[PDB]
Amino acid sequence: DYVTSGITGEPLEAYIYFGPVYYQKLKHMVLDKMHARARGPRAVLTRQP
Amino acid sequence: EDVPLLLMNPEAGKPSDLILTRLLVPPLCIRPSVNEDDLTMKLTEIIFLN
């Protein structure tokens, strides 16, 4: 398709492929994966985190 | 005189020390009280046998 740039308003030189593609959301989310430790609880046998 | 020729260093140990008639039991922090401790049970089995 003939595509116009949304930043500059001038048209793009190459034609851009446009269509509906099925996209599925995966269970891996960054909110369930961000982690940080400053200092905290330690094991009883080896006194390391 | 013959202990150095066994390559034993006579200030680190003797032939007599190999066989043990005594045994040290480690401090409690080597083997903490909690699952349910079984290292203490292994020592208990040796005490029970004696």
Side-chain angles (χ1 to χ4, degrees):
Chain A
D1 291 323
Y2 174 80
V3 183
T4 307
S5 179
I7 295 168
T8 60
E10 296 178 351
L12 301 183
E13 299 199 355
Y15 300 111
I16 308 297
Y17 205 36
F18 258 89
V21 176
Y22 200 62
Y23 261 85
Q24 64 205 345
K25 193 179 182 184
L26 305 181
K27 70 175 281 281
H28 297 279
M29 295 173 283
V30 63
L31 198 156
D32 295 335
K33 285 179 173 291
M34 180 176 66
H35 171 57
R37 177 179 166 109
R39 68 177 69 88
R42 294 178 179 273
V44 182
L45 176 57
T46 45
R47 298 185 184 169
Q48 72 186 16
Chain B
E1 180 180 1
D2 303 345
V3 175
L5 292 170
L6 305 173
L7 273 296
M8 296 196 70
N9 184 0
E11 293 171 352
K14 298 179 289 177
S16 178
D17 304 329
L18 275 52
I19 300 73
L20 63 88
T21 185
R22 193 172 279 88
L23 184 66
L24 289 176
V25 300
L28 300 194
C29 61
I30 315 299
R31 44 173 182 145
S33 67
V34 181
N35 202 348
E36 169 50 32
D37 194 12
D38 66 348
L39 248 215
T40 337
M41 277 304 311
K42 297 259 55 181
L43 280 173
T44 277
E45 292 161 36
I46 301 173
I47 295 167
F48 155 89
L49 269 167
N50 282 309

PDB file of all heavy atoms in Angstrom, chain B residues 2-21:
ATOM      1  N   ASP B   2      61.513 -44.908  61.640  1.00  0.00           N
ATOM      2  CA  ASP B   2      60.986 -45.480  60.409  1.00  0.00           C
ATOM      3  C   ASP B   2      59.698 -44.822  59.940  1.00  0.00           C
ATOM      4  O   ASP B   2      59.243 -45.118  58.833  1.00  0.00           O
ATOM      5  CB  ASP B   2      60.752 -46.978  60.596  1.00  0.00           C
ATOM      6  CG  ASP B   2      62.004 -47.713  61.019  1.00  0.00           C
ATOM      7  OD1 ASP B   2      63.103 -47.136  60.896  1.00  0.00           O
ATOM      8  OD2 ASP B   2      61.894 -48.866  61.486  1.00  0.00           O
ATOM      9  N   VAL B   3      59.086 -43.977  60.773  1.00  0.00           N
ATOM     10  CA  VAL B   3      57.866 -43.269  60.356  1.00  0.00           C
ATOM     11  C   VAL B   3      58.090 -42.310  59.186  1.00  0.00           C
ATOM     12  O   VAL B   3      57.227 -42.269  58.294  1.00  0.00           O
ATOM     13  CB  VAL B   3      57.194 -42.620  61.575  1.00  0.00           C
ATOM     14  CG1 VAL B   3      56.001 -41.774  61.197  1.00  0.00           C
ATOM     15  CG2 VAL B   3      56.757 -43.681  62.550  1.00  0.00           C
ATOM     16  N   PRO B   4      59.181 -41.507  59.106  1.00  0.00           N
ATOM     17  CA  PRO B   4      59.393 -40.699  57.882  1.00  0.00           C
ATOM     18  C   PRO B   4      59.487 -41.481  56.578  1.00  0.00           C
ATOM     19  O   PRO B   4      59.184 -40.924  55.517  1.00  0.00           O
ATOM     20  CB  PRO B   4      60.705 -39.965  58.168  1.00  0.00           C
ATOM     21  CG  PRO B   4      60.714 -39.789  59.583  1.00  0.00           C
ATOM     22  CD  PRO B   4      60.086 -41.011  60.169  1.00  0.00           C
ATOM     23  N   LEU B   5      59.899 -42.746  56.612  1.00  0.00           N
ATOM     24  CA  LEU B   5      60.027 -43.514  55.382  1.00  0.00           C
ATOM     25  C   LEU B   5      58.697 -44.060  54.898  1.00  0.00           C
ATOM     26  O   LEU B   5      58.627 -44.565  53.772  1.00  0.00           O
ATOM     27  CB  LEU B   5      61.010 -44.668  55.571  1.00  0.00           C
ATOM     28  CG  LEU B   5      62.470 -44.285  55.779  1.00  0.00           C
ATOM     29  CD1 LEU B   5      63.275 -45.498  56.180  1.00  0.00           C
ATOM     30  CD2 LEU B   5      63.012 -43.688  54.503  1.00  0.00           C
ATOM     31  N   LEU B   6      57.651 -43.994  55.718  1.00  0.00           N
ATOM     32  CA  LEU B   6      56.278 -44.218  55.275  1.00  0.00           C
ATOM     33  C   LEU B   6      55.659 -42.997  54.605  1.00  0.00           C
ATOM     34  O   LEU B   6      54.464 -43.034  54.292  1.00  0.00           O
ATOM     35  CB  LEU B   6      55.408 -44.630  56.458  1.00  0.00           C
ATOM     36  CG  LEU B   6      55.872 -45.837  57.258  1.00  0.00           C
ATOM     37  CD1 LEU B   6      55.009 -46.018  58.481  1.00  0.00           C
ATOM     38  CD2 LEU B   6      55.823 -47.055  56.386  1.00  0.00           C
ATOM     39  N   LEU B   7      56.438 -41.923  54.432  1.00  0.00           N
ATOM     40  CA  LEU B   7      56.070 -40.598  53.922  1.00  0.00           C
ATOM     41  C   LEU B   7      55.068 -39.841  54.791  1.00  0.00           C
ATOM     42  O   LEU B   7      54.623 -38.754  54.409  1.00  0.00           O
ATOM     43  CB  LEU B   7      55.555 -40.676  52.478  1.00  0.00           C
ATOM     44  CG  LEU B   7      56.558 -40.606  51.317  1.00  0.00           C
ATOM     45  CD1 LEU B   7      57.232 -39.254  51.314  1.00  0.00           C
ATOM     46  CD2 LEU B   7      57.593 -41.711  51.330  1.00  0.00           C
ATOM     47  N   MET B   8      54.700 -40.381  55.949  1.00  0.00           N
ATOM     48  CA  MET B   8      53.969 -39.604  56.938  1.00  0.00           C
ATOM     49  C   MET B   8      54.863 -38.526  57.534  1.00  0.00           C
ATOM     50  O   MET B   8      56.004 -38.793  57.917  1.00  0.00           O
ATOM     51  CB  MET B   8      53.419 -40.515  58.029  1.00  0.00           C
ATOM     52  CG  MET B   8      52.397 -41.492  57.515  1.00  0.00           C
ATOM     53  SD  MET B   8      51.457 -42.225  58.848  1.00  0.00           S
ATOM     54  CE  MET B   8      50.520 -40.788  59.334  1.00  0.00           C
ATOM     55  N   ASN B   9      54.346 -37.311  57.603  1.00  0.00           N
ATOM     56  CA  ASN B   9      55.049 -36.221  58.267  1.00  0.00           C
ATOM     57  C   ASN B   9      54.821 -36.374  59.765  1.00  0.00           C
ATOM     58  O   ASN B   9      53.676 -36.271  60.217  1.00  0.00           O
ATOM     59  CB  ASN B   9      54.523 -34.877  57.754  1.00  0.00           C
ATOM     60  CG  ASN B   9      55.257 -33.664  58.327  1.00  0.00           C
ATOM     61  OD1 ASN B   9      56.186 -33.774  59.118  1.00  0.00           O
ATOM     62  ND2 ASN B   9      54.827 -32.486  57.905  1.00  0.00           N
ATOM     63  N   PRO B  10      55.864 -36.629  60.562  1.00  0.00           N
ATOM     64  CA  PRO B  10      55.664 -36.955  61.981  1.00  0.00           C
ATOM     65  C   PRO B  10      55.221 -35.798  62.865  1.00  0.00           C
ATOM     66  O   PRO B  10      55.101 -35.993  64.079  1.00  0.00           O
ATOM     67  CB  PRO B  10      57.044 -37.464  62.408  1.00  0.00           C
ATOM     68  CG  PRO B  10      57.982 -36.754  61.510  1.00  0.00           C
ATOM     69  CD  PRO B  10      57.284 -36.688  60.185  1.00  0.00           C
ATOM     70  N   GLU B  11      54.996 -34.605  62.325  1.00  0.00           N
ATOM     71  CA  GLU B  11      54.423 -33.509  63.085  1.00  0.00           C
ATOM     72  C   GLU B  11      52.980 -33.229  62.707  1.00  0.00           C
ATOM     73  O   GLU B  11      52.308 -32.473  63.412  1.00  0.00           O
ATOM     74  CB  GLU B  11      55.260 -32.238  62.891  1.00  0.00           C
ATOM     75  CG  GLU B  11      56.651 -32.326  63.486  1.00  0.00           C
ATOM     76  CD  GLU B  11      57.531 -31.158  63.092  1.00  0.00           C
ATOM     77  OE1 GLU B  11      57.110 -30.359  62.232  1.00  0.00           O
ATOM     78  OE2 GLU B  11      58.645 -31.043  63.643  1.00  0.00           O
ATOM     79  N   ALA B  12      52.492 -33.817  61.614  1.00  0.00           N
ATOM     80  CA  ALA B  12      51.087 -33.772  61.250  1.00  0.00           C
ATOM     81  C   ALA B  12      50.303 -35.005  61.667  1.00  0.00           C
ATOM     82  O   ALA B  12      49.085 -34.913  61.829  1.00  0.00           O
ATOM     83  CB  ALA B  12      50.936 -33.577  59.743  1.00  0.00           C
ATOM     84  N   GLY B  13      50.956 -36.149  61.839  1.00  0.00           N
ATOM     85  CA  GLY B  13      50.249 -37.317  62.331  1.00  0.00           C
ATOM     86  C   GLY B  13      51.181 -38.497  62.484  1.00  0.00           C
ATOM     87  O   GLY B  13      52.353 -38.457  62.094  1.00  0.00           O
ATOM     88  N   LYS B  14      50.631 -39.549  63.068  1.00  0.00           N
ATOM     89  CA  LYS B  14      51.291 -40.811  63.355  1.00  0.00           C
ATOM     90  C   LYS B  14      50.514 -41.936  62.690  1.00  0.00           C
ATOM     91  O   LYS B  14      49.347 -41.750  62.325  1.00  0.00           O
ATOM     92  CB  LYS B  14      51.352 -41.049  64.870  1.00  0.00           C
ATOM     93  CG  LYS B  14      52.137 -40.022  65.635  1.00  0.00           C
ATOM     94  CD  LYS B  14      52.106 -40.356  67.108  1.00  0.00           C
ATOM     95  CE  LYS B  14      50.723 -40.106  67.679  1.00  0.00           C
ATOM     96  NZ  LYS B  14      50.637 -40.493  69.108  1.00  0.00           N
ATOM     97  N   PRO B  15      51.148 -43.093  62.447  1.00  0.00           N
ATOM     98  CA  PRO B  15      50.377 -44.292  62.065  1.00  0.00           C
ATOM     99  C   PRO B  15      49.270 -44.665  63.039  1.00  0.00           C
ATOM    100  O   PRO B  15      48.215 -45.141  62.606  1.00  0.00           O
ATOM    101  CB  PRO B  15      51.455 -45.374  61.993  1.00  0.00           C
ATOM    102  CG  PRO B  15      52.666 -44.652  61.646  1.00  0.00           C
ATOM    103  CD  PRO B  15      52.594 -43.343  62.358  1.00  0.00           C
ATOM    104  N   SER B  16      49.499 -44.477  64.343  1.00  0.00           N
ATOM    105  CA  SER B  16      48.511 -44.779  65.376  1.00  0.00           C
ATOM    106  C   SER B  16      47.208 -44.009  65.225  1.00  0.00           C
ATOM    107  O   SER B  16      46.171 -44.470  65.706  1.00  0.00           O
ATOM    108  CB  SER B  16      49.106 -44.476  66.748  1.00  0.00           C
ATOM    109  OG  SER B  16      48.157 -44.709  67.772  1.00  0.00           O
ATOM    110  N   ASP B  17      47.236 -42.850  64.572  1.00  0.00           N
ATOM    111  CA  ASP B  17      46.061 -41.999  64.483  1.00  0.00           C
ATOM    112  C   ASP B  17      45.094 -42.440  63.397  1.00  0.00           C
ATOM    113  O   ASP B  17      43.948 -41.980  63.393  1.00  0.00           O
ATOM    114  CB  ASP B  17      46.489 -40.556  64.247  1.00  0.00           C
ATOM    115  CG  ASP B  17      47.441 -40.069  65.306  1.00  0.00           C
ATOM    116  OD1 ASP B  17      47.333 -40.545  66.449  1.00  0.00           O
ATOM    117  OD2 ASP B  17      48.298 -39.215  64.999  1.00  0.00           O
ATOM    118  N   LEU B  18      45.550 -43.277  62.453  1.00  0.00           N
ATOM    119  CA  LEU B  18      44.689 -43.743  61.332  1.00  0.00           C
ATOM    120  C   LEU B  18      43.454 -44.444  61.907  1.00  0.00           C
ATOM    121  O   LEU B  18      42.333 -43.948  61.673  1.00  0.00           O
ATOM    122  CB  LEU B  18      45.494 -44.687  60.433  1.00  0.00           C
ATOM    123  CG  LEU B  18      46.338 -44.013  59.353  1.00  0.00           C
ATOM    124  CD1 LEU B  18      47.215 -42.926  59.948  1.00  0.00           C
ATOM    125  CD2 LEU B  18      47.192 -45.033  58.614  1.00  0.00           C
ATOM    126  N   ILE B  19      43.652 -45.562  62.613  1.00  0.00           N
ATOM    127  CA  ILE B  19      42.512 -46.261  63.279  1.00  0.00           C
ATOM    128  C   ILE B  19      41.966 -45.321  64.357  1.00  0.00           C
ATOM    129  O   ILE B  19      42.787 -44.753  65.105  1.00  0.00           O
ATOM    130  CB  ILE B  19      42.974 -47.611  63.864  1.00  0.00           C
ATOM    131  CG1 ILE B  19      43.525 -48.537  62.777  1.00  0.00           C
ATOM    132  CG2 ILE B  19      41.859 -48.279  64.651  1.00  0.00           C
ATOM    133  CD1 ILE B  19      44.884 -48.135  62.255  1.00  0.00           C
ATOM    134  N   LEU B  20      40.640 -45.190  64.462  1.00  0.00           N
ATOM    135  CA  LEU B  20      40.072 -44.209  65.424  1.00  0.00           C
ATOM    136  C   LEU B  20      39.316 -44.924  66.547  1.00  0.00           C
ATOM    137  O   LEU B  20      38.411 -45.723  66.233  1.00  0.00           O
ATOM    138  CB  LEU B  20      39.158 -43.243  64.664  1.00  0.00           C
ATOM    139  CG  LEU B  20      37.930 -43.868  64.002  1.00  0.00           C
ATOM    140  CD1 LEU B  20      36.754 -43.907  64.964  1.00  0.00           C
ATOM    141  CD2 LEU B  20      37.547 -43.098  62.750  1.00  0.00           C
ATOM    142  N   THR B  21      39.693 -44.669  67.804  1.00  0.00           N
ATOM    143  CA  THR B  21      38.923 -45.222  68.950  1.00  0.00           C
ATOM    144  C   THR B  21      38.029 -44.101  69.488  1.00  0.00           C
ATOM    145  O   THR B  21      37.283 -44.353  70.455  1.00  0.00           O
ATOM    146  CB  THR B  21      39.856 -45.781  70.031  1.00  0.00           C
ATOM    147  OG1 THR B  21      39.046 -46.403  71.029  1.00  0.00           O
ATOM    148  CG2 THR B  21      40.726 -44.718  70.666  1.00  0.00           C
TER     149      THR B  21
END
